[PDB]
From Swiss-Prot:
The chain holds residues 58 to 114 of 1687 of the full protein. It is found in: Secreted. Monomer. It comes from Norovirus (isolate Mouse/NoV/United States/MNV1/2002/GV) (MNV-1). This is NS1. The record marks 49 as: Critical for determining viral persistence. Promotes intestinal tropism and persistent fecal shedding in strain CR6. The lineage of its organism: Viruses, Riboviria, Orthornavirae, Pisuviricota, Pisoniviricetes.
Length: 69
């Protein structure tokens, strides 16, 4: 097994916010926090293992995080 995609967009991704209490504890406060958490995770994963694809449609956010609506 061999292959390297070396994706050049490194971003920052640190600005996203989370809920701190109740059933929502650990989850995004906003649509943009959810989008940027998926971006930050993809970018770190991409640095460890370059093959991964970034997907964060509004439907991907509501499927991962059903409280965003």
């Amino acid at each position: 097994m061999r292959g390297s995609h070396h994706h050049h967009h490194h971003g920052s991704g640190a600005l996203a916010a989370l809920h701190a209490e109740g059933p929502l504890a650990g989850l995004p406060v906003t649509r943009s926090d959810a989008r940027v958490l998926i971006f930050n995770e993809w970018e770190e994963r991409k640095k460890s293992d370059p093959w991964l694809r970034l997907d964060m449609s509004d439907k991907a956010i509501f499927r991962r995080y059903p409280h965003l609506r």
